[PDB]
């Protein structure tokens, strides 16, 4: 047991906050940390395969991924990370306080997780699940990636990755982009109306989802970028990162708020 083991004393489960596989709760560690806690249901899935989100939040720090915090990694299995008081950026953006997000804080949002991202780019690591429901909201407005489906959903997934297992840094590039959609339609899921085969046959043909109402066109752009059919042609997420945090001088500076964004 290297340093990362809790005892299971030290840890208190108050508040459920999701269900599935096992559950996660809102808890207390050492009766002073406020923590989130994942629990796997025994004999359900991999005690190894439940562990590796672990593996790799080990080796991963930064400001912009949920911390790892502990682990009790004999069944049954409790991982313990930092607690995100806002919940996921999907209910986030589709719920009450979402209504009155507008483009400058979507963006921030978005320069944020690109962040996040371009620590895992420099790290030569993958996430493979990008997208607002892997996002956590903290105070202020802070954004984090979470949920790693792996290290190194068809709407959200590169046209290579979802045909030919070809997962890459640029596959999550891809994500990106239709992440950069769920932030401007307010957590709409992509593609509306379309099954995930039509979705799959259409991105392959050339479709690429339309400029939402009130998005700028320079931010589709960049979203077409994220989407470019030769993954070696997208952008980095350290070109993305610095593309949004400088958005509203070097890109939009004549931005005014509207009904929505
Ligand atoms: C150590 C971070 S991790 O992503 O690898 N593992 C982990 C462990 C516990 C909880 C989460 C993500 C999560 N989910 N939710 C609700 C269900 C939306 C949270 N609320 C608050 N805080 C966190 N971390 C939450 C990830």
Redesign the pocket.
């Known amino acids: 047991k290297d340093a990362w083991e809790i005892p299971r004393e030290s840890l208190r489960l108050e508040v459920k ?2 269900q599935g596989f096992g559950e ?3 808890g207390t560690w050492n009766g002073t940390t406020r ?4 629990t796997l249901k025994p004999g359900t899935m991999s005690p190894e395969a439940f562990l590796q ?2 593996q ?2 080990k080796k991963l720090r930064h400001e912009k ?5 502990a682990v009790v990694s004999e069944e049954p299995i409790y ?10 950026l999907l ?1 986030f953006l589709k719920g009450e306080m979402g209504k009155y997000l507008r483009l400058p804080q979507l963006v921030d949002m978005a320069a944020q997780i690109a962040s996040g991202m371009a620590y895992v780019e420099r790290m030569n690591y993958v996430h493979r699940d990008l997208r607002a ?2 996002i ?1 909201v ?1 105070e202020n407005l802070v954004c ?5 489906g792996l290290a190194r959903p068809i709407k959200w997934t590169a046209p290579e990755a979802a045909l030919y297992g070809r997962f890459t840094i640029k596959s999550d590039v891809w994500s990106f982009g239709i992440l950069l959609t769920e932030l401007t339609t307010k957590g709409r899921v992509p593609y509306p109306g379309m099954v995930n085969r039509e979705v799959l046959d259409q991105v392959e043909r050339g479709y690429r989802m339309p400029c939402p109402p009130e998005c700028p066109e320079s931010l589709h752009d960049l979203m077409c970028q994220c989407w470019r059919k030769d993954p070696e042609e997208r952008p980095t997420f350290e070109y993305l990162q610095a593309f949004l945090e400088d958005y509203f001088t070097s890109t939009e500076p004549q931005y005014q708020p509207g009904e929505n964004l």
């Open positions: 906050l999701g996660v709760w809102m923590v989130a806690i994942k989100e672990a790799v939040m991924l949920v911390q790892l915090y991982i313990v990370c930092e607690y995100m008081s806002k919940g996921s209910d429901a892997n956590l903290g984090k990636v979470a949920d790693f």
